[PDB]
Structures are given as structure tokens and as C-alpha cells.
Design a protein around this ligand. Structure first.
Ligand SMILES: Nc1ncnc2c1ncn2[C@@H]1O[C@H](COP(=O)(O)OP(=O)(O)O)[C@@H](O)[C@H]1O
Ligand SMILES: Nc1ncnc2c1ncn2[C@@H]1O[C@H](COP(=O)(O)OP(=O)(O)O)[C@@H](O)[C@H]1O
Ligand SMILES: [Mg+2]
Ligand SMILES: [Mg+2]
Lengths: 524, 524, 74
């Protein structure tokens, strides 16, 4: 297509309107006195949200140039989110700030490439400053505080996260899903359990729960899928003359194999369960091995030159108890050579280290949790579905922010930390004066989050910023209670990693943006 | 697509027109002096309805923003309905009221998030208050009264429902379908019957009804499908030399098996019936077992290592009598070990408890009714098809409301209960003044349903509400008779669950909606 | 109903309670108290209330019975 090309102040003005439309839709949501945005959907009911990256992704503009502006800042809000799952609005606000101020200095006749160098220098500095202000967030109280503050001042979310983190440990997973009723609920699965129902429903040995409960059983791990009773007989026999029951976790159990196994327990010959293997493909065998370790059994892998028939009692795993229903199997306390557990854990722990993506990272730390600590699930309650969405999203949001606090610490919220590092850099200079204005452009933007927070309360941002600027350390404005005080004492904590990422990403794009001198796009 | 973004009062005003167009179309139908709405259909003839959720689903607006308004309130009316199948108009009315008032206070410069917190607090309190006003609805008269009031003051529907509930018991199902003639009709099937006709029509032993009537017969339950006479012979023989007839409920009967069975009764060798198994897939075997229990027979399942041939008289079920026509089979009073019936019932009764959806809930309580109480069917009469639809719907409506009264009790209708809890919370306050206005916003909305009821009568809503507010307990306005009195004594009962759900769902979305500050949607 | 409305109060409510009374019991919109309108010094000469009514009625009937209207071209 034929293109519309725009140059200099023209192109920039357009670019700025584009930034502005987006930034302003995102802003309205900043802080405890934030408000919501409604995003339409051809799908079904609209979406009500407070979450800056959610709003951002929706903004697309009709003016092809204004659009380019919007589509660019949009990535600060986006990246912020992939990074720590929070602070996206802050980020957006900072970028809109760096850009506004920067462009003004380009119109003053400064060299944009220097304005950029200044901004970047200002920021590399600001990041060190933050790492200095950061104090570790390690107690349960502090964790609850980041959670709470992240969930728009929802004390209950904070507490639930804090509680979960406490139970599943440090290498335990926490997931959030829709709840049944109106109230929030926390589940913690103890020991190891995978998503697997009995293949033979005619084997439930407790009709009360509708579930199988094998007392102190042997465990047969079969890598290959089973179809014939033949391969079982040698082993099935050794167990029969031993008294103890037997669980079978194979790739699958079907045919007359499954069928006869039924009549074998239906009579009282042997007590034997059958459930599919956890996972699919090359993940299955990896996971099936996990089970072997925890129960002190040997995986009978038809692959590595092994017959199911030639397995003895030797190769079988053992457990204290087993609980199986229509959807999940649970091994309660397996024999598990203590040293061989944590060894196989420290090995999978390092498999995440060299995980070449995000997916080969997820599943790995899932497995570690099944083998080490625990698995936790949070259920968000809601009267409606417009409510479920917004509430669930906040709980996810906070879940992220706590994980960020834990790895990178906390600083004072209300955007005080940023206002603080800006006065610490009052003496930063660069190679040349343009660079100096460039530095000052960033320091000035560092006041934005506090100023929006305040504006969103309907109070005067330059009066609050002024008195906050007038104190020290963690003095800050409590927008929720409209009084000044020590932000950490008041439990208004931002996770350092998000404050920092908001600054970094926003500066990263705003920096480039202010150096636009030409813009090429399609004809209307 | 490029988007149209709207902010603040602009976006809200549009949002409210949206709410209004919907709310107003729904309102016209509230109460005994409610009126009908006509909803068009490309399909065939339009639909005349009084049913709030039916109207609601149809509203969609041209103004993308007004539409978002409408599509949001639409969910209160929708959820209300999935929750108790009644009160959807009331719900709608409350939401339009919470929104109207809320928005007005946002324009006064209150903090919407606090307006929300107050509305919610007000509501949590209102719900406790309702649970406190609720008195159990347990006698047949009270049940008829909720039915009646639900069916827009149709005394006949009330009575018919009450009658049905009385016969099928508490764990019995009641369904509604189009009737043949002009009058309403109640059918009650006694004992157990499934949707199954004879496979051999040349076996009818009573040409008068066109149906099979086996006296005191044996019952053969075959899990597998039959095709060969072979497997029968051992069993078929034992029955032949026993004199008693035999019903066969297999997965299917075809081939020369079915054929020879005919000539075996056609001659007088044996008396034997053949009818397909009730259900399909994994449901069938579950249900086929139900029959075994009620007749003291053993399911011959080819699956769990069993041959049809090796069954004896032992495994056969027995009944007092059996009635089979071209469409349904009925077992009248099977042997059924008393203790084993109610045990198998209390087990399926708990299978509904852990039913992970709505469908694995439906079929289960269907089966319990076939094994415990009875099954009832209501047939709605109508001259026309425009009439059948609207009447049938009301009967369904009332069927629901009674089920809700029974589980959650009743409060005073005419919206008195709500007007009453609003004076009870006259002293509720929140953390701050905005929250207090927010509380007061909800208490005021609580007057809405009474106000509309009255407005629909063409009388003055603020004169009625005034005198109703001037009384106590269950004093209220009888819109139908235009006189005041005790609403419970007058039989104007709302099921508590619905009054409460209307409040909950309406507040749940209204609450969010009044916190809109920006709205994003497509260009026209 | 109009006086009440102009004052920013509810018409139906004031109207209903005025009707609930007898004689010259009424609502004094200026002070928002009910009472005897004459005692309270809110009165119209009978001529004027009547004249208003009759004259309103005349023009209204005239209109309800108008079938044709003749005027100059725009
Ligand atoms: N009580 C409060 N007073 C002042 N600032 C607060 C208060 N509560 C939270 N904040 C701050 O407001 C910011 C807003 O968080 P949020 O609105 O989610 O923006 P973001 O999407 O950028 O995370 C947080 O940085 C937090 O520091
Ligand atoms: N005689 C009556 N007088 C006053 N209120 C009545 C009378 N009959 C029914 N109602 C009330 O009117 C309401 C109307 O029910 P309906 O029009 O179906 O609204 P919805 O769809 O919200 O159930 C019920 O809440 C009931 O309390
Ligand atoms: Mg946040
Ligand atoms: Mg109703």
C-alpha cells in the first residue's frame, strides 16, 4: 500500500495524542481510589476491570499515527505484566510522563539521542537506588501486606495468599480458579496427587466417598500400556501370597486385563487398583519415575529392555495408604529413601535452572511441589460473573506481587520510593547539557505515580507531592486514609521488582519514542 | 478494530441510558398488574411474555455504549434466573435503582469505590435480616400460595403444584409440558417406569390397551446386548419349568433370538417380554442396576466376567406385575430388599451432593424418584400457541418458586420484606461518609420493587410506600385488591431465596457499574 | 400538583393528603404545612377559581370539537 509519511513536530504531536488516549484510559485505575474501565466485547457481556494491562491491550485508534503512538506505549504496560504481573498502570503512567516531558525538550531544540542517554543514565541510577531501599520481605505479615495492597486493599486476599505461601512452602505452587459459592476458599493438597481416576469403577472399596482406599499397598509402575492378564500373573501372584494390596499405574489398562482384575478383587483373591499414567508423551515417563522415587519402586520400562512378566516384589513401590476417586489418585506417604527424594528433587530443581523457556519451567516446579512441599488452590467467590472475573484477576495479581516481593523485596508505596530515589539523584549529570535535561526529564517523571494516585482521590497532586517531598525515608501519603505517615508501618508496600520493572520498561520505550523524527504508515 | 473510548460523566450517562432501555422493557411486567412484552422472532410468530429474563436477553442497543450498559445489567436478570428461576424482574428493578442513585452520588463527587463498599455492607446486612424474617413454608396451603403468586395470581397453578408436591413426595420430580386440550392436567406415575417399548409387538397379551401385562414375573437384566437364543436356553428353561413369566431388559434384543422368543409365547411354551435398556452409554449400566435393586436381581454383566448362559433362577429379579406398551415399561412393586432400596437410595442421594455440575445432578435425582417416591407431569392447556408458551412458562416459574420456598422459606411479598429490612438497617454505617451514602443508596433501592408494583397499578408509589413504611412486620399493600393488610395472611408470599438473590445479584453488578470511569468499544 | 412540583416536592404525595381532608384543609407550599388554607391566609376569590376553570373548559371543549383549521401559507 501507498503510505502516509509524517515528519518532525507533526509526526510527534500525533504520536503523543496516541500515547495520551491510551495512558488516560489506563490512568483512571491507579491506586486505592482508582476507578474501573469497561471494555466491550462482541463475544458476550462487557468486562469491568481495574487492571492497567487489560485496558491497554484494548486501545486502538482510528488515526493511523495516533495509533502508532498508542501501540508503542502499549508495550510498557504489556512487558511490565509479563515481568511481575503487576504495576502495569504505574509503568504506563511513568512512560506517559517521560514522553510528555521528553518531547517538550525536543521542541526546545535539544538533541533527542542525548535526551535518551540522560534518561537511561538517570534510570540505571534509579535502579541501584531502589535495590538499596529494598528490604527483604520474608515474614508472613509483610507478604500479606503486599498481597493486600495488590488486591486494591483487600485484606482477605492478602491473608489467604500469606496462608497458602506458608503451607506449600517456597517450592510449592499456588493456582487460582472460580469458586463454587460466594466466599473465598483455600485448598492445600497434602503429599502427592495427580489428575487420575480409577479405570475400574467396580473396584471402589468405600462406597461412602465413592473412592478407593488401599491400605499399605504395593505399587506397580508400568511404562508400557497393559492389555493382557498374562504379564501380570508372575507379579500379581507374589502380591496375592503376600496379603498386601496393589496399585497399578500404567500407561493404560484395558481389555480382559482390566476386566479380570475386577473379578479378582470382587471375589477377594487380590486387592488391586488401576489408574492411567499422569501426563502424556515424554512428560509421562519423567513423571512416572517421580512416583517410583517416592515409593522406592522400579519403573518397568518396556523401552529399556524390560519385561513386565519378569518383575518381582523387588521392583514394586510401597505406600502407607492410597486414595483414589473418579478424578484423582493420591499416594499418602511412600517408603521413599529420604536421601534419594531430595536428590531427585535437587536434580529437577536444577532442570528448571536450565529451562530454555517458560513451559519447561512451569511443569518442572509443579513436579517438585508434588515431590517436596505441597500444592495449593485458591477459589475466588462471587455473586455474579462480571464480579468473578474482576475479583479473580486481582487475586492472580496479588499472587504474582507476593512472589515478586519474596524474590526481590519491598519498598515504600504511594510512589514514595520513586519520589525518594529522584532526590537521591538530584546531583546526577551526564556528558553534556542535553543529557542533563534528559536526566532531569526522568527524575521529574518519577513523581508521576504519586501524583496520579493523588489526582484519583480528587486532591491536589502538587500539594501532596510537595509535603511528601518535604520528608524523609518512608514518609508518605496514605491516599486511603488521607493522612501522612510511615508507609511501611501502614503496610503500604510495593514489591521492589515491580517498582523497578515499571521504571525500566517505561523508560525503555519512552526513551526511543522521543527520538522519532519520521513516521511511516498506511493511508486512511 | 479502532476503538471509541469514553470517559467520566459522558461514558456513565450513555451507560445509564443503556441500563434504562433494558430496565424499562423489563419493568412493565412486574407484579399482579404487570403487563406483557412482545419479542419479535425471524423464526415464526412473536412471543408474548411477562417473564423478565425473557425480555432482558432480547435487548441490544445500537449505541455501542448504551449497549454496554444494557449488556451489563442483563446479567442480574440472567443470574437471578439460573439461581431460583424467579424474581428476575425484581432483580432488574433493584439494579436499575442501585445504579441510578449510585451514579447520582458519583456526580456529587463521592468516591465510587466507597459507594460500592457501602452498598455491599448494606446488602450483607440485608441478607442476614431476610434470613431472620424467613419462616418455613411447609404446609400444602403455603406452597399453593407461593405457586399462585408466582403464576401471576393463578390459583389453579398453585393448587396443581401443591397437589403434585404432595404426591411424588420430597425427592420426586415434577416436569411441565404442552397439554392436549384446553385445561391443565396432572399425571402421577406410580412406582418405577422408564421410556421403553416392547421390541416384539407380536407379544402384546392384552389387545385392549395394546400393551403387555405380565403377572408376577421373573426379570432378566442383561448388561450386554442379545442376539442368540443359545445364551438364553439354560435360564429360559428354568423359568419354563417354573410357570412364572419373564421380562428381559437387555442392552438390545434382535436377530433370531428376538424372533424365536415370539414363537415361544405365541405357542404357550414360555411367557417372555423384551425391551431395550433405559439410557445410553455409562448411564445405562448405572440405571440397569437400579432395576436389579428394586427387584432383587443380579445384573448379568458380560464386562465383569459373567456369562449369560451360567445365570440361574437365583440371579433373576421378581415383581408383583409388569406393564409394557409401545413407548414405556413399568415394573409394579418389585421384591426389593427394603433395606437395600433405601441404602442404594441414600448412596445415589449423596452422588448428587458431589455432582460437579447441573447435569450429573438432574439425572441422579430423576433416578432417586424412580427408586423412592413418584414421578409427576403437569400438562398446561391452551387454546392457541401464543398462549401455550406464556402459560407454560408461568407454570414452570411457579414450579421453581415452590421448590425455593421449601428449601429457604418465605417472606412478605409486594416487596414488603425488602422495605422492612431497609428500616432495620437505618442505623448501619461504614468506615467513612462516602460509605454511608453508599449504604443509604442501597436502602433506598430496597423500596424499588414495591414502588414499581404500585406504579404498574396506576397508583401513586410514594403514597403506598409511605403507608407501608408506616406499619410493622408483614403489613403491606395488596395491589390486586387495592387494600392494605398482613401479607402472609393474604397469601402473598415470596420465596426467601428469591428475594435474597434479587438483592444479591442486582447489587453485585450495580455495585461495579457505578465505578466506571472509562469505557472502550468499537467505532460505529 | 404543579405548585408542589415547582417547589421541588412530590405532587402525588401532597395531593393525596390534601384529598384526605375536608373543607379548606390544604397544603401551603410556601411553608410546607398542612392546615386550613383560609386561616393560613392562602385564598383565591371564588370568582377567580371558577372563571379559570370555566374558561379552561371552554377552550378545551372547543378544541376537542375542532375538525378544521385554516391559515396562511408558510
Ligand atoms: N493506601 C494507599 N495510599 C497511597 N498509595 C497506595 C495505597 N494503597 C496502594 N497504593 C499504591 O498505589 C499503587 C496502585 O496500584 P495499582 O492501582 O494496581 O497500580 P498498578 O497496576 O500500577 O499496580 C501501588 O503502587 C501502591 O503503592
Ligand atoms: N396481590 C399482590 N399485591 C402486591 N404484590 C404482589 C401481589 N401478587 C404478587 N405480588 C408481588 O409481586 C412480585 C411480582 O412477581 P413478578 O411480576 O413475576 O416479578 P419477578 O419476575 O421479579 O418474579 C412478587 O414479588 C410478589 O411479591
Ligand atoms: Mg497493581
Ligand atoms: Mg415472578
Amino acid at each position: 500500500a501507498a503510505k502516509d509519511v509524517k515528519f518532525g513536530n507533526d509526526a510527534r504531536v500525533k504520536m503523543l495524542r496516541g500515547v495520551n488516549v491510551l495512558a488516560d484510559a489506563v490512568k483512571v485505575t491507579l491506586g486505592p481510589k482508582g476507578r474501573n474501565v469497561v471494555l466491550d466485547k462482541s463475544f458476550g457481556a462487557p468486562t469491568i476491570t481495574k487492571d492497567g494491562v487489560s485496558v491497554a491491550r484494548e486501545i486502538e485508534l482510528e488515526d493511523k499515527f495516533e495509533n502508532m503512538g498508542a501501540q508503542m506505549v502499549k508495550e510498557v504496560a504489556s512487558k511490565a505484566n509479563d515481568a511481575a504481573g503487576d504495576g502495569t498502570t504505574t509503568a504506563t503512567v511513568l512512560a506517559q510522563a517521560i514522553i510528555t516531558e521528553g518531547l517538550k525538550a525536543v521542541a526546545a531544540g535539544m538533541n533527542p539521542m542525548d535526551l535518551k542517554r540522560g534518561i537511561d543514565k538517570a534510570v540505571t541510577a534509579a535502579v541501584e537506588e531502589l535495590k538499596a531501599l529494598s528490604v527483604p520481605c520474608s515474614d508472613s505479615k509483610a507478604i500479606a501486606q503486599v498481597g493486600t495492597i495488590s488486591a486494591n486493599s483487600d485484606e482477605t486476599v492478602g491473608k489467604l495468599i500469606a496462608e497458602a505461601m506458608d503451607k506449600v512452602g517456597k517450592e510449592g505452587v499456588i493456582t487460582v480458579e472460580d469458586g463454587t459459592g460466594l466466599q473465598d476458599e483455600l485448598d492445600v493438597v497434602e503429599g502427592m496427587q495427580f489428575d487420575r481416576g480409577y479405570l475400574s469403577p467396580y473396584f471402589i472399596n468405600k462406597p461412602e466417598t465413592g473412592a478407593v482406599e488401599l491400605e499399605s499397598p504395593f505399587i506397580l509402575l508400568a511404562d508400557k500400556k497393559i492389555s493382557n492378564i498374562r504379564e501380570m500373573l508372575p507379579v500379581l501372584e507374589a502380591v496375592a501370597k503376600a496379603g498386601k494390596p496393589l496399585l497399578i499405574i500404567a500407561e493404560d489398562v484395558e481389555g480382559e486385563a482390566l476386566a479380570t482384575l475386577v473379578v479378582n478383587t470382587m471375589r477377594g483373591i487380590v486387592k488391586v487398583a488401576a489408574v492411567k499414567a499422569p501426563g502424556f508423551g515424554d512428560r509421562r515417563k519423567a513423571m512416572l519415575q517421580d512416583i517410583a522415587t517416592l515409593t522406592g519402586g522400579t519403573v518397568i520400562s518396556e523401552e529399556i529392555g524390560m519385561e513386565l512378566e519378569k518383575a518381582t516384589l523387588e521392583d514394586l513401590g510401597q505406600a502407607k495408604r492410597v486414595v483414589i476417586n473418579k478424578d484423582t489418585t493420591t499416594i499418602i506417604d511412600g517408603v521413599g529413601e529420604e536421601a534419594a527424594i531430595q536428590g531427585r528433587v535437587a536434580q529437577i530443581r536444577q532442570q528448571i535452572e536450565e529451562a530454555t523457556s517458560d513451559y519447561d519451567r512451569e511443569k518442572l516446579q509443579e513436579r517438585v511441589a508434588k515431590l517436596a512441599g505441597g500444592v495449593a488452590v485458591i477459589k475466588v467467590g462471587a455473586a455474579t460473573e462480571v464480579e468473578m472475573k474482576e475479583k479473580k484477576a486481582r487475586v492472580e495479581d496479588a499472587l504474582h506481587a507476593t512472589r515478586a516481593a519474596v524474590e526481590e523485596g519491598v519498598v515504600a508505596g504511594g510512589g514514595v520510593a520513586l519520589i525518594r530515589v529522584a532526590s537521591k539523584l538530584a546531583d546526577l549529570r551526564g556528558q553534556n547539557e542535553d543529557q542533563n535535561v534528559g536526566i532531569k526529564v526522568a527524575l521529574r517523571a518519577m513523581e508521576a505515580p504519586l501524583r496520579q494516585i493523588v489526582l484519583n482521590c480528587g486532591e491536589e497532586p502538587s500539594v501532596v507531592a510537595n509535603t511528601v517531598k518535604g520528608g524523609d525515608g518512608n514518609y508518605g501519603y496514605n491516599a486511603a486514609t488521607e493522612e501522612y505517615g510511615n508507609m511501611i508501618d501502614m503496610g503500604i508496600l510495593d514489591p521492589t521488582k515491580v517498582t523497578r520493572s515499571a521504571l525500566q520498561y517505561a523508560a525503555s520505550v519512552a526513551g526511543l519514542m522521543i527520538t522519532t523524527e519520521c513516521m511511516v504508515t498506511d493511508l486512511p
